């Protein structure tokens, strides 16, 4: 029954080692709900937990929706309410996790009060989880969701461009995700290609000065930008 903050952080680290990410998420949610600021280590534990949880739900939703799209093809058997029902079950569950993350960010984490790196981290997180909602949104609500993700990413972009150098991994990661948003969600392949090209080129013009430790995190994200650019432009 050890439900103080330090114990919750401890149990989240244990849940990570045990690959129990739903448990890790609930320990991190409880830690956030204590009302104190998260450290850089603690922010990562929160992100890792929920990224793994939604990762599995998104992967599942993609499988089910792909089967559902095959069953609605012209000239197929086109019968079976089971795929739709079960795709809806997974989808509702996925939406619940995004709404939980977004609620924590708005009620406890995103403050005007915060440091640059931490504000960017949380606002990027707000854009990501609205992007995940947009992946499954088909209704009248799709535009509201897409707009909410753009505002979060744009607000995060403004802070990173003002306070961070172009080689910063948080800044690089944000720009990568926002370009994925442009391509996949906003249906703006030109904006996506442009952002990714600009981000990679600006960071490349500064690699020379980077310390040994920073070089690894930055070049990792830069390879992700390069891979997307190869895929999107076809080179």
């Amino acid at each position: 029954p050890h439900m103080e903050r330090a114990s919750l952080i401890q149990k989240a680290k244990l849940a990570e080692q045990a690959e129990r990410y739903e448990d890790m998420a609930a320990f991190m949610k409880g830690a956030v709900e204590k009302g104190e600021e998260l450290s850089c280590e603690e922010r990562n534990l929160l992100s890792v937990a929920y990224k793994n949880v939604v990762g599995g739900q998104r992967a599942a939703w993609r499988v089910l929706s792909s089967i559902e799209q095959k069953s609605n093809e012209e000239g197929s058997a086109a019968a079976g309410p089971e795929v739709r029902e079960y795709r809806e079950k997974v989808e509702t569950e996925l939406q619940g996790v995004c709404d939980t993350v977004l609620g924590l960010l708005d009620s406890h984490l995103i403050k005007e009060a915060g440091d640059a790196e931490s504000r960017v981290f949380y606002l990027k997180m707000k854009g990501d989880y609205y992007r995940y909602l947009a992946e499954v949104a088909t209704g009248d609500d799709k535009k509201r969701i897409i707009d909410s993700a753009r505002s979060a990413y744009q607000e995060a972009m403004d802070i990173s461009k003002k306070e961070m150098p172009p080689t910063n991994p948080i800044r690089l990661g944000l720009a990568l995700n926002f370009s994925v948003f442009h391509y996949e969600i906003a249906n703006s392949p030109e904006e996506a290609i442009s952002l990714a090209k600009t981000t990679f080129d600006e960071a490349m013009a500064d690699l020379h000065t980077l310390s040994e430790d920073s070089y690894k995190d930055s070049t990792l994200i830069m390879q992700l930008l390069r891979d997307n650019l190869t895929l999107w432009t076809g080179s």
Partner: peptide, 7 residues
């Protein structure tokens, strides 16, 4: 072959 985002 699928677009990379974070991690």
């Amino acid at each position: 072959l699928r677009r990379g985002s974070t991690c």
